[PDB]
Amino acid sequence: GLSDGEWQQVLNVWGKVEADIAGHGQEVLIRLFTGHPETLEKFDKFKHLKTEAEMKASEDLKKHGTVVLTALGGILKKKGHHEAELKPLAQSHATKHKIPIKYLEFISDAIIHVLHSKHPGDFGADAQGAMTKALELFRNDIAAKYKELGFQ
Ligand code: HEM
């Protein structure tokens, strides 16, 4: 549950991501895969990437980064009213992709990391607080659908 002020910050920060959605998406996935290599194993089309150089050079990884952040942005722009947007993602990630909620925690923190890296001194304390809350909300609503499905 975010305030309007907080949502305003979130969508303000998001404007940064939208100026370069592929570059941000790329760096988030790279930060995830290198921070937590077990996550790479969930992708049959990235599992071949051994090195970070190969990750950086991967146009298909950048492509998927675009897909992921496009979906997250659509959800964020709903300001919490994202049940229709979120339900199919929860279902596919639980039932088809089999992604534990721990990995959503991982990518949440990775987004925070990337924003500081790409915008040092331009991602203030209030901004981080708002973005973190928004990602927690997202995660918590997925977690509810996971529980429903009995998925661990
Ligand atoms: C912000 C969090 C995330 C968002 C918004 C997101 C969004 C999406 C979308 C829109 C797709 C394609 C449609 C679909 O299959 O439902 C997808 C596919 C996929 N996602 Fe996620 N995802 C997120 C996090 C993760 C994480 C943390 C993992 C694994 C560690 C993951 C694993 C996958 C895999 C394996 C696919 C299918 C890839 C393929 O073979 O095309 N996702 N995701």
UniProtKB/Swiss-Prot annotation:
Residues that bind heme b: 93
Stretches of the chain forming a coiled coil according to its record: none
Binding sites annotated in the UniProt record for O2: 64
Pfam families found in the cross-reference section: Globin (PF00042)
Name of the featured protein: Myoglobin
Keywords: Cytoplasm, Heme, Iron, Metal-binding, Muscle protein, Oxidoreductase, Oxygen transport, Phosphoprotein, Transport
Catalytic activity field: Fe(III)-heme b-[protein] + nitric oxide + H2O = Fe(II)-heme b-[protein] + nitrite + 2 H(+); H2O2 + AH2 = A + 2 H2O
Phosphoserine: residues bearing it: 3
Keyword Iron: yes
Role summary: Monomeric heme protein which primary function is to store oxygen and facilitate its diffusion within muscle tissues. Reversibly binds oxygen through a pentacoordinated heme iron and enables its timely and efficient release as needed during periods of heightened demand. Depending on the oxidative conditions of tissues and cells, and in addition to its ability to bind oxygen, it also has a nitrite reductase activity whereby it regulates the production of bioactive nitric oxide.
PROSITE patterns, A to Z: GLOBIN
Binding-site residues for nitrite, renumbered to this chain: 64
Family: Belongs to the globin family.
GO biological process entries: oxygen transport; removal of superoxide radicals
